[PDB]
């Protein structure tokens, strides 16, 4: 019983929120904060008197306008402003003259409104008991008179409280506390939206602005990636994570190359050591950031190392992208494949045939086709744009998944977690990955890996995850597909060159074939080294299959492998799979004439599990057979070396034999804990190791990002500290460990790669820093993650305190440090023109401490759309430091009293600066609600669609019975639904989106439809595809 009441949205099942309900003269609005009914309306821009009592209205008064009498973002004030008055009312009973030393809040003597003005009574009272407790609420409607009373006793036992506990402490807390608990100081005023890639709930783009001229830039062209060189398209979102880089800057891409430099030379720069250096770069974030990017570091590891002169010179210095979208390969190949593109449509093609459960696995005739290359018959070298390709990441199929597992064990909130949670969700996650039936981990992984490793044309990267338990410390525990992988990487090595064919049958069964180094074609009889080398593979993702009696499954070995033995190397079994690391008790099979290997239903010469049959067990859901021929040497070794003969064309990698050679280990998890010994670090144990990853046939170690976390929490890389979320660029593991041990942990690291024939990876991540100490007003609009404005919010070109000042102590001492040594060494370095500026990199300036005008905007930071106080007609208070000296009345001495809205009679006016009647205008109160004064001067407010126009612009408005233009929502009459847009004018004849809904509107402004997506409302995995 007495509960309230709501309108329940048929597409949501919850509440509709801000919602107008009309029936002839009656109505009833369904508020923002829970949807609750009332038609009972505040009044929303009534200031009221200031201090009748002159000993308070002249004690209160600041002491100056001084930056230390007037807390204050570059001359800003905020909700949390403390400020020195005049005088304070010592004890609650004597006026003093203040101390630079007694600041007190200026909520303790201003209100943005009456309402917020009565809340703060409330609050005080209740939670400061700085008013006796018994007292009833204030009401909105209370008059100035009993409202400063109040006010006034709050600030006396404020007083009496400072001087009994000789401390302001508590005050802070306090008043902090009520701040929060406001919508215009808090996230509910910011439009928290997951659409796209808002993975912390919105973005705040920065603007130009006479308001914030130190935070101006010339700069800032946004989405400009391999598809959007010139701005005239979409292109990938600016906007991701954080405080998002303006890498249009050329001063910025100088710094960008400053710190590339550094990467490259980080052993010889901290250490004095050569041996301990990165030898390639991982390309964070590649559709997120201008892609001059690009184009800057192929230039440096052009001028460098040479990177174009051979393919022994490209492959020593292997460097990838994780380019998601599917034109950028294209692109990559056009700017001379200075990284490596991934191969999304092959990646997409194993997760739409074999890594799904059974009911969903497409047929596995994609394999052949999707890609940038067809395999098949893959007879060529240099051919195809080169590229490496992997089943899983630590961001791909792995951290969702994970957190749906954590989710899942503990109950929380997707993403939310502490250690005990990680490890309670990880033992899930595990029980679930040595499942048949599996609900977060991907199926057919041996088979996955089989295409993955087999395939020609293709730098394959192995994925820690697949080898080792996600979770747990480094190398902790084997996965179950340990033994499989290992022996397929081995296998790699020593047995799969040549050319490829691969084809499906009229079964559905797909055999894939290499032929053996110096054998490209079915019909080429190869070399003396060809004979012992090749691999054929029988795969099926057909739970159920059964061949009749008579059919057969062939693997056409080709023309080097006639009447030939053979041996298995990886065998289906009911129960998983048996793998064979030699010749040794392998079971074995003979081609015929032909060079044709025939298997059926039917083991072959009683030797289990060489029938091809149906199967579903934790490894296998359907058949794997992976079959390599008998008697080659133990140091076979079927592998490819690059050549050093000169390039034709202008390009690194090259698509060949040699680049095949190569295999990528990502040599994490997000989900490695933080170590508990110094031998429990990952840096420790990869120096230790580097020989078994040598036996595997690494050629390149891509280690995390070693930056040091920001642990801040604010998304799963600074919850896990993998290295993707960091304050200082340059501090790796240097002012304290990163989760992987400190920089000498991680330079010998590199050196025991280095000693152990191996590569190593720098993960270059250009596209955001996290939480830097420093604030700073700056002029904003709330925006999507193409920094499109986000039409409902409020916040449009509005001043907020952003977080943006500081790097921490490396980016100071080594910001712009190695510029003048590049522009001796490397000078063709800083003639380049690059494509989106249209102009060279910019080293006149060093950046040593980043601020706002080097940056494009941040993630929303929950301070609220009126965190910055404003006075009404959208005045910003300052101390005259950014923009005009203006100061609430409360403190200065300028009299409130006439100016502002005012009562007379029936009817509201406004009254401007100049004390004068303001008619046929459109203002705004100091809460942000917009008001019309009609030709009379009078507020409108009759709830009934009006026409205006104003500077030559139409619109249909409708103002509440309070005075406030409704905007961003529905309102229902008895004649159809209507809805009004973010600036208060009915929408027509046009689909639109507000947050989470999309309204369709015929031409008369009625909804004829509208839909949910609750995507919107929360942080959710990635959808397949969502970024290609
Ligand atoms: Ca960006």
Redesign the pocket.
Same mark, same amino acid.
């Given at each position: 019983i007495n509960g309230q009441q709501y309108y329940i949205d048929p597409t949501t099942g919850q509440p509709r929120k801000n919602f107008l309900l009309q029936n002839g003269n009656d109505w009833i609005y369904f508020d923002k904060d829970t949807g609750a009914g009332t038609n009972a309306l505040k009044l929303q821009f009534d200031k009221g008197t200031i201090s009748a009592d002159e000993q308070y209205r002249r004690g209160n008064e600041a002491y100056s306008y001084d930056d230390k009498s007037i807390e204050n973002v570059n001359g800003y004030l905020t909700a949390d402003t403390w400020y020195r008055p005049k005088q304070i009312l010592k004890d609650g009973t004597t006026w003093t003259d203040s101390k630079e030393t007694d600041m007190r809040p200026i909520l303790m003597v201003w209100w943005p409104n009456t309402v917020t003005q009565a809340y703060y009574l409330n609050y005080m009272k209740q939670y400061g008991n700085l008013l006796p407790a018994s007292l009833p609420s204030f009401s909105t409607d209370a008059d100035s008179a009993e409202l400063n009373h109040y006010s006034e006793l709050v600030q006396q036992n404020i007083e009496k409280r400072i001087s009994e506990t000789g401390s302001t402490d508590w005050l802070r807390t306090l008043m902090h506390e009520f701040v929060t608990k406001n919508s215009m100081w808090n996230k509910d005023s910011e439009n928290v939206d997951y659409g796209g890639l808002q993975l912390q709930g919105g973005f705040l783009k920065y603007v130009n602005s006479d308001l914030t001229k130190y935070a101006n830039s010339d700069w800032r062209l946004?989405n400009r990636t391999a598809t959007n060189i010139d701005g005239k398209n979409y292109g990938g *979102?600016?906007?991701?994570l954080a405080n998002?880089?303006?890498?249009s800057n050329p001063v910025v891409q100088a710094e960008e190359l400053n710190w590339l430099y550094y990467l490259m030379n980080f052993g010889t720069i901290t250490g004095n050591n050569p041996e301990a250096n990165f030898d390639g770069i991982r390309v964070d *974030?590649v559709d997120?950031?201008?892609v001059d990017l690009l184009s800057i570091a192929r230039d440096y590891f052009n001028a460098a190392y040479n990177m174009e002169q051979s393919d022994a010179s490209a492959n020593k210095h292997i460097n990838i992208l994780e380019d998601w979208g599917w034109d950028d390969p294209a692109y990559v190949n056009k700017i001379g494949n200075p990284q490596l593109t991934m191969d999304d449509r092959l990646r997409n093609a194993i997760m739409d045939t074999l890594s799904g459960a059974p009911d969903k696995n497409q047929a596995l005739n994609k394999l052949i086709t999707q890609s940038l290359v067809n395999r098949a018959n893959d007879n060529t070298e240099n051919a195809v744009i080169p590229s490496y390709n992997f089943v899983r990441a630590h961001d791909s199929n792995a951290q969702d998944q994970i957190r749906q597992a954590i989710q899942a064990a503990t109950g929380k909130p997707y993403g939310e977690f502490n250690l005990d949670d990680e490890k309670k969700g990880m033992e899930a996650y595990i029980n679930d990955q040595n499942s048949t039936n599996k609900k977060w981990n991907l199926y057919n992984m041996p088979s996955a890996y089989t295409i993955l490793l087999t395939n020609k044309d293709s730098v394959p990267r192995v994925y820690y995850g697949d080898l080792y338990q996600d979770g747990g410390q480094y190398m902790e525990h084997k996965t179950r597909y340990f033994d499989t992988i290992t022996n397929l990487l081995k296998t790699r090595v020593k047995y799969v060159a040549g050319g490829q064919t691969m084809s499906v049958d009229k079964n559905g069964i797909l055999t894939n074939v290499r032929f053996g180094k110096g054998a490209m074609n079915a019909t080429d009889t190869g070399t003396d080294e060809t004979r012992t080398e090749g691999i054929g593979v029988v795969i099926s993702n057909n739970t159920n299959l059964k061949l009749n009696d008579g059919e057969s499954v062939v693997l056409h070995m080709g023309a080097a492998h006639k009447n030939q033995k053979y041996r298995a190397v990886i065998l289906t079994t009911e129960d998983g799979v048996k793998n064979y690391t030699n010749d040794t008790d392998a079971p074995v099979a003979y081609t015929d004439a032909n060079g044709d290997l025939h298997f059926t239903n039917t083991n072959l010469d009683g030797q289990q599990y060489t029938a091809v049959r149906g199967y579903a067990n934790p490894d296998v859901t359907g058949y794997l057979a992976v079959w390599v021929p008998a008697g080659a040497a133990d140091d076979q070794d079927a592998r490819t070396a690059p050549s050093d003969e000169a390039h034709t064309t202008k390009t690194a990698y090259r698509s060949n034999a040699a680049l095949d050679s190569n295999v990528i280990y990502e040599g994490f998890s997000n989900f490695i804990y933080w170590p508990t010994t110094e031998s429990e670090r990952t840096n420790v144990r990869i120096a230790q190791n580097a020989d078994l990853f040598k036996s595997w046939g690494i050629t390149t170690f891509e280690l995390a990002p070693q930056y040091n976390s920001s642990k801040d929490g604010t998304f799963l890389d600074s919850i896990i500290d993998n290295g993707y979320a960091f304050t200082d660029r340059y501090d790796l593991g240097m002012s304290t460990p990163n989760k992987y041990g400190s920089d000498e942990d991680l330079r010998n690291a590199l050196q025991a790669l280095h000693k152990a024939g191996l590569q190593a990876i720098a993960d270059w991540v250009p596209?955001?820093i996290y939480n830097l100490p420093g604030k700073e007003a700056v002029t904003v609009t709330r925006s999507d993650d193409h920094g499109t404005t986000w039409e409902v919010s409020p916040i449009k070109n509005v001043v907020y305190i952003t977080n943006t000042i500081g790097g921490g102590e490396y980016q100071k001492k080594y910001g712009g440090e190695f510029l003048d040594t590049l522009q001796k060494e490397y000078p063709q370095l800083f003639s380049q023109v690059y494509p989106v500026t249209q102009t060279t990199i910019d080293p006149s300036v060093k950046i040593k401490e980043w601020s706002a005008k080097y940056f494009?905007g941040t993630n929303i930071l929950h301070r609220g759309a009126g965190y910055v106080l404003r006075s009404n007609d959208g005045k910003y208070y300052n101390l005259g430091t950014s923009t005009q000296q203006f100061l609430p009345s409360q403190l200065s001495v300028q009299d409130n009293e006439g100016y502002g809205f005012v009562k007379e009679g029936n009817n509201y006016h406004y009254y401007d600066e100049n004390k004068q009647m303001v008619k046929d205008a459109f203002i705004q109160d100091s809460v942000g609600n917009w008001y019309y004064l009609d030709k009379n001067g009078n507020m409108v407010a009759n709830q009934s669609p009006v026409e205006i126009s104003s500077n030559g612009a139409s619109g249909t408005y409708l103002f509440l019975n309070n005075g406030t233009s409704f905007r961003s929502g529905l309102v229902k009459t008895d004649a159809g639904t209507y809805y009004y847009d973010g600036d208060g004018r009915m929408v027509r004849n046009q689909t639109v989106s507000d947050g989470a809904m999309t309204y369709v509107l015929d031409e008369n402004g009625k909804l004829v439809s509208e839909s949910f997506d609750s995507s919107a409302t929360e942080a959710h995995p990635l959808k397949p595809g969502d970024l290609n």
């Open positions: 946004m *979102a600016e906007f991701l998002d880089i303006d890498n *974030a997120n950031v201008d596209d955001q494009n």
